[PDB]
From a paper:
The LftR protein transcriptionally regulates the expression of the lmo0980 gene, which encodes a putative multidrug resistance transporter, LieAB (Listerial importer of ethidium bromide as artificial substrate), and facilitates the export of toxic chemicals from the cytoplasm to the extracellular space. LftR contains 108 residues and is expected to belong to the PadR-2 subfamily. As transcriptional regulators, PadR family members commonly contain a winged helix-turn-helix (wHTH) motif to interact with operator DNA. The apparent molecular weights of both LftR proteins were estimated to be 20–24 kDa, whereas the calculated molecular weights are ~12 kDa, indicating that LftR forms a homodimer in solution regardless of construct designs.
Author numbering:
A (entry chain B), B (entry chain A): 7 to 104
Write the structure that this text describes.
């Protein structure tokens, strides 16, 4: 019911500390959005790197494979800023409709 | 970005006075989505009649074709309330994230 917000919901989670595909997927699941799988998140996480909106600290393990840790870039700091202003707008309009 | 709410927003308009396809579509254009088309509204109306959520007063003219006037059935009343409760639900959670 909100796949549009998913791209900005993720940047929201990344805005409050270094995080990883799993932790971000779990946080979305905890919010009530249990329909999504790890993969769906990573496939947006890849997209956000391509577009330049996240920064990457690749972290190694002797216990398993390497995980990526995600941070907002200045561009992503900006793009998230826009996303919310977009939300505020639409809620506000619906509000006056009601 | 609101093509799914379009059905509920129309029921919202029908809730405050008897009304007709054009007035509905114009009200929509006044709300802001000027991507709307008179046609797009009528198809939804037609579906709403068939779902049993609106009531028809067909009104004639010697000036041109007849126009159906729409008002809410008791079911449409119920259905619109369900939609608002849903917006409330989703606005609340989004804003909690925010």
């Amino acid at each position: 019911a909100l796949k549009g917000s998913l791209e900005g919901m993720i940047l929201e989670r990344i805005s409050r500390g270094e995080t990883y595909g799993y932790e971000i997927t779990k946080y979305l699941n905890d919010l009530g959005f249990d329909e999504i799988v790890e993969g769906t998140v990573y496939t947006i996480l890849v997209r956000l790197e391509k577009k330049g909106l996240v920064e990457i600290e690749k972290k190694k393990s002797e216990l398993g494979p390497p995980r990526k840790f995600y941070t907002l870039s200045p561009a992503g700091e900006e793009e998230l800023a826009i996303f919310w202003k977009r939300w505020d707008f639409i809620q506000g309009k619906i509000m006056q409709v009601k």
